[model samples]
Target: KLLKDLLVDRKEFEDWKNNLTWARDGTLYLTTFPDISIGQPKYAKDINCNSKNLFHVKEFPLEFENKLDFELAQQNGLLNSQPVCYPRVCKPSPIDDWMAVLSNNGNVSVFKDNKMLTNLDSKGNLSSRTYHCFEWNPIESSIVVGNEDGELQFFSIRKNSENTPEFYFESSIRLSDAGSKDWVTHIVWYEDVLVAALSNNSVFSMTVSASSHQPVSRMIQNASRRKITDLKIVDYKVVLTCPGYVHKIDLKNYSISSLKTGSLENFHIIPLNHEKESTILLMSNKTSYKVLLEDELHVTADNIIAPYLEKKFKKWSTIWNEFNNYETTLVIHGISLSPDGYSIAIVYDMERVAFKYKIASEQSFNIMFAPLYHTWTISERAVGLAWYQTYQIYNQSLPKLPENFSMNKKLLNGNYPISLDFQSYLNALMKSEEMRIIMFLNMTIDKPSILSFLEALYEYAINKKSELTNSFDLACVLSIAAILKREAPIYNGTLLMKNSFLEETFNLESFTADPETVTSTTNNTWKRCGVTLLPILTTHVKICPVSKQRVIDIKRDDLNDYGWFTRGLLERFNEISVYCGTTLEVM
Candidate 1:
């Protein structure tokens, strides 16, 4: 028979096995279970043991110097007569202000100054049935609760005119069927997106817009076969844990990636802004592994090396064997990383103690053990709450970019422009078989005589030693105009004259007149030869004239009797086409 000290003492067991919680500012709260019994007949000298009922609740702050600050919930009537199974407590959203105590008796209570503000009950409503999970918003003004029937209800609290707190039902949504056998186990809100883990191996999300009303709800059917033990949402990604696998779900793209290990018992995803990474800590039998998200699949060295060493050494197998043989025992129920991702905390079951470690560097991590008088369990587990107290610890601010950086510079320095530097320009044109043909058609000017205009541009490029900067891009742009011109052809007198021998033959009037008389008698002959004269003359005349008398009359219509000399080029041609052909001077 075991000795009195060796035997399990019920009173001592209750004190050591109770649930505990840690606040943001290092304050710890502990709860005590009340001893209860059923009725029985009593004998003369207590021959029969009678049932006794003794329920009580205790609250303690770790920083209190004496027992005076410690208060018992029984004194405030917070304890109930019914038996409670899981008594879970969580601090408010911001992790700094308030804390809520959730009891298995279907009551959710919030405490500010040892006073309850909102004590809500599900009553008989199926939608407000027994809630198994509850989450406070990060900003802490509202709370989301999941009932047994897979229904979610949100509650918002505000101060009314009389300075009294008033509670209002913000919104509610049902995730599963009313007859669903599985219940919601966890609920977490990441920014505007809400993620819920169900006992039936399912997860769902809903977008909560910046309004008092609820947003549209959607189901995320990624984990179809595995029971999600824990879930944490960081930014646009969701980190989840099952029996032996850890999954990272990219909510934006609905892509899933996983890491498999030896029965990954529990895990926590800590969003670290300092490292600009999400740190995932996984706990198994004896060893723990940390995983960090660097880039796509590139996690940092610390997450990589620890798992690699454990895999090679078979640490999990050794630890399990030791625990089974009673040589050593460990039950890693929770794994947590500090807010800065620089430290880690783990709890062990057998010793009822917690351990802390300082991550020295990526290559080496050191551990330190601390003994505590608490036993951690999966249902009412003890978790560490960290505040990003140091503003300088996180690297949320982005780096500055150079002032001169622009889109044009990026285009010029990108792969497209760099590929053009290889080979001679003419060689590249000849080697680009189909591409060259497409470019040739696009570069040709829109004219009636297509072949003549194409030949002229070809000769111009060869003579000037010039090439298009972005030949491919320019070809694509010009192809649109080329298609339009091909469908609707325009007339070009210059192109026709260039293909014919019309320039060498002089106009009949020019051939008949004396050279000195034609030159001296021409109206503004020197000024007409200048480039500015065509626009000035064309602006005044609505129609083109090929004869000197017609040209003088057209100009004089606007300015009465303005002619002082005869026209020069117009005097040599009788038709508009001949005058335009002479101006082109193509042979």
Candidate 2:
């Protein structure tokens, strides 16, 4: 420490203070930027060209008709980016008002009307050839800046020595990998975390403490390390988009899942910062969509609504269908919605083609089954909530529930088709672990549709009955359900093995008749009470309940050989898989 302080071998650099430590599973992390040095004026420079124009503030136009460009493309170059190029000095528009443009001169600029908001200098960040990336907080009250140098600093809007509005330093974090060649290119700011994507395609997830607003500090050493194109916050999650896929890095477990995709250096995976519960649209070759849930980027909505067109290029109206399960007849290539949000254009050609029977109301289905929530001013009033809003309420925050959801609210409010409706309900019952949800469904659902429900549950019982205790409850539900539908179990020959026998057990004359004396030699009460084997087992192999004594002589057919012998034994035993006490041996 004295060595660093005494470096005034001149303006010698002294150590910066208060990195602050945090707790891990009993381990400790001390926040420090060994990679970056401070307390001296000898750091960084305003190199002129490497990052001169590597980045910009982009916007989408309000109108596209007479228009040539200015739009968004999630993966590659902007769809409407060409024909018109935006200048760095252009004022901001309602659509482009939130841009924070960073330049390599160590001068970080925030823009509003083609004019700069605050001129914050990152005098110690990094050298030129250092691509700069910046972002504003949701409230735009603060800004986060990073560069090719391993420096991450926090700045807030305030007044400077000139009494003019400026970005004042709050605190900073330097990555600990001292002298490491890694540099920062992109960053996503969270109230609790600062996720910086480095030039090496590496990421550092630094966390902040609300207690002290304690300065930047690990916590990413490895995992999902790849070439990242952009980092954006969605529903409070940091979604890192690459060229082939999009990944959500779980802050807790730090696991990365490939959820969704994008493009080249031209465009980025910038989701519209407009609505809290906005639909996430992506242009992967063509536009695809996912419903964004709050606090995370998971798509919890089961249905996607669009304005579907018809055969003759008929009328236009909003249509709803399963989000993942689409009709084979419908090949949705791309989506482009109009400014009004009322109806969208279908750019996919069914050959460039059209529609399915409109399931507009309740009459379109056989089962009148439906479900809604519990709390309401009126019990009959339907409950509506989107995935995003539900996610907020789930987090114990200011709860908001909208009148419509990105789910199959259509099934509850509107009519749906038979096959899909039944299939959908069956899947719900089959997948549900919640008793009330499935029980309520089975009780009210009717007709041939209910038959489908029972089959699904029965199938569930057939496979998982042994492992799950509630599987019996599932079976009971199916039984009652079948009774309601006038249906019965459909069994096929299949055995579940307990133990296979080899000797006199599965042999032909094993059907040896019973004798009073042999009855005494029987195993147990079940053996004595067992039913008589008046039944024949294709005559090749058989077992008769007895006391180890014969009563009947069996005649053999010319077909009685060891080949048919083994086949006949299995043929009879294979007829059943389930029974209260025993599961037959299966081969």
Candidate 3:
């Protein structure tokens, strides 16, 4: 991927460019395969007819010459034949003011002023075994060529009386190393210190000051099998790249090491100095970055918060050291800090959805704003909410029930506790604990016989329709007259309260009755509804529900003549039985 597509066209097809290098003197050297392929239809070949691998210096072909007959080649359709020629290597000498090129056929050649001077192929006894690569000294006075045969040879420049420069073999060596088959693929010279990258996934390093034929060398073995792509000499170290790893060779101490860069097939490294400290910038993907400094390769976590949200919540830090594999680094899309330096707003990738988070302290109020579901629908997740408070939504306090509201009135939506007669209505309120509380307050009525008036009052309260205009509305109300009879006091006027000025009573206790223990008969709701009553006599309303009868027959008891008006009212209190699907009412 490092090489970009530059000027791709119909041309340059099958051009097996073997090597390309440039010198500091602005000289360019290029090499490639011949203008033909290895296979032919006539000769049992499968290569392209125009496949060409050639060596060039500034477009002047420093390539092998095809000594074929052009006319005969054309007549025999050989002009369309595959070119069995290619360049193996090419390089421009940086300081030596020279350029060298070699081919797959062992055609070694040198060029001066864009013109070929010496053809190493024309030299005496040059073999057909192709050279893998070559390197020139900084001064360009000498060069070394490494072949696929595990042999390395050094050559020196020579000049005849005509001042024509030529090459003379100086020395050779055979480091019959493993893996690479000693087949040298790359060579670089940092002054007199020569280092070579072998096909064996290893590097051979030594100094030329010691020996030309056989230097006291040490091999840095990297693997049993690997391909070395590049090498760089930086300061006192030599950096190498292969596959997903990077290795460094200590130039001073002669040792090799690797870096933990995960699975990056390629990356870029740049050494930097800040505050007089050395650091290297290593990068590959968005999640991976390291400023390698000395022996440390970790980055410190930065905690930033805003001022306004500093103390909203509580947090405590502890000293502990345990780690797990699920731990990962954060790669940010966006984030924010609180005003008070105690809160932070992190934006993630739902996280990436780009919502800001307020870090609120748990000890105090945490103001959070989640979007409303609809305009009217309240979120059940309101803070400090429970039970009845859970579903009730109010901007301020709950509004008073509609002034004209009545239980017996038809509803626009639907009515609760539907359809009932006088007795059945009393049956519902008397046997139900829920109705007892509501009827006690929102209703105003009076009765006589203490218990009878209370019963009549209870029945009146559980009903609906506004009129309680009878003069006896306060008949049972406590008075000195009732005290003379030793009668209990009746309902009184409003008893009001105001807790807006007071703090919450969090110390209020709730009684908990365990199932295994009970102090009295009715400790829970089941007992209250399980054994209930009738308002007048406080007797069981119904019994023997499964005896082919839900309620036993009640004698035809006539109405008492308390008075002509009250007589008809009491006669209307007829009782009836009804069956429902409720399983709990079996008794």
Candidate 4:
């Protein structure tokens, strides 16, 4: 609904709708509808909302004014019957300030700052050309394109004397064997590796050096039985999709494996950061399936530390199942995943509408109509959808584990431990692949598992109560228990790390063995330990809610008048909220 509201028509939505693209800086780019009227005002009705064929967003009413446009087909000495100059693909450079569009006339137009920077024309008739798919180099300011003659072409972009952008054809590599008719259909450029899929069901992976402007090495993988549809890179692995399966190429070992997803017509694999996994959105005409690509160590034959991917039993869910007309209404075009991964944008040509559908545990069909917008004319149905690629949150790395933290190297034996070693407890709980599968991937544990985990933490804190030198450590554990307590029903018993080392105090204390000296030094050591654990523990634990002691009042604020163990703990935890980098406001 918000997307639809932002995209109210500046003009009739484009006929070449799949040309819609989103720039990284929250701008929407789209080309105008193809002009088919001969010797007439092409945009008579929308003279004020005119476009040169391309338009992008400008706020303060959220209008899409003109960015840049090429000569229309009618204006470019082409017959009105042959609208052959429309953009077939529109792509924004992932790293640089450049935009490119591939037209049906075999021309790649590169633009910068609303000016046509250059045009790479594939002279001769359109059908006689070779270029099929192209991608911007993720690690450098270059564009790589795949062609019909099994060749990959590189175009490097740079600035000239006047500080104007320019692109030049650099070099090409034959992906398939020489003279092979296998057309390169899809390509993904990650860092230095280039993965391209061909029309004959073969994929080529190659490493290229920017310094040399040439390929270093090349390898090929085949899904010979099926036609490859899409190629994507997730966490350095090359993921490809065909009609009935999704394949992964482990770049680390150059081994390939596939998962059989029966009857998958068109699919997209979206990398998710929070879960450290990927979501595969499998789409047919009227139906779609959502699956997660997750790490399962046992799926392999000998469990040789191979992180195999598999779909959970309940993980597969049906999306877009509300539409009943299965036979005629084709929905193959304009399928795109939203930036946040919570919704899908689809174009239903037969219905003459475009809509955004949410992905939730329960069905969200009713809300699908919220973003639905009708076409202006019978032939004006939307044919594409694009969402802004919002800036990704930087993933902060966890601190290095202490040398004694070797429990994570082995599998878990049983339930969580009630030991004061909170780090080991978390490591062991997460070590169990079953628990990690449920806890991390699905992100939701059964009520029993939650209760048991919570009870373990509670028991740990109870056992370590008197031994705890700082009140903050106890507060951190109990606070997390209280947060989880707010979510599930109170169990009869339930749930819920860090280390403290004191070197400076230990040096002085080691010199004296007096009982008073030992007692004071020991107290100071634990105090120092508390200070050490505060940041690491609070970053995760402080990102929750709790109470004054064990009581939480529903009517009052958790940080204010209702519940807090101490002013110092409250102030420190509140300070840590800035580092937690999350919001408590309802969306």
Query: Using Cα atoms with residue i matched to residue i, what is each candidate's TM-score against the true structure?
Result: 0.45, 0.34, 0.37, 0.45
Error of 4 at 284 (Å): 4.3
lDDT of 4: 0.41
> Residues 1-587, candidate 2, lDDT per residue (tens digit)?
00000110111111121111111100111111111111111101121221111111122221112111222332222233444322211111112123343332333555542345555554432342122556555334676666445666667765667534556667666753667646666676655666777766766776654626565455453534567755665554566666666666566655556654443321134243334453354433223445363434555422222211232223211232323233323233222221112112222222222444333221110000011111211101011111111111122122223445322223222222223332354344433322212222221223102233334434434444343233213223333334334343342222111112311112111123231111111221112101112122221322211111111112232322222212222232232111100112111
What lDDT would each prediction earn against the true structure? 0.39, 0.33, 0.36, 0.41
What would you estimate as the lDDT of candidate 3? Answer: 0.36
Q: Write the per-residue lDDT of candidate 4 for residues 1-587, one digit (tens) a residue.
A: 12221222223324323433444322344443341111110111111222211122332111121212233332223322333355556676765546676655545667764567876534333222436678887777888777657777778866575757788777777767764566677887777677788777777787776556556645658548677766787666777777767777778666766777666655545433233444444445444444455442112222110111111111221233344333224332343433223233333333223534423222211001011111111010111111101111001112123344332232233344655255555445434443322222111112212333434445555555565443344434434445344322122221111223212223222212221122222344222112112222111222211111111111222322211222333333232111111111111
The per-residue C-alpha lDDT of model 3 at residue 109 equals 66
Sliding window of 10 residues with minimal summed lDDT for model 4? 375-384
Which sections of candidate 4 miss by over 4 Å?
1-20, 30-83, 121-130, 223-225, 283-285, 289-332, 335-587
The candidate, 1 or 4, that scores higher on lDDT is 4
In each prediction, how many residue pairs overlap at the backbone (N, C-alpha, C within less than 3 A)?
Answer: 2, 13, 39, 11
Please report how far candidate 4 places residue 81 from its true position, in Å. 12
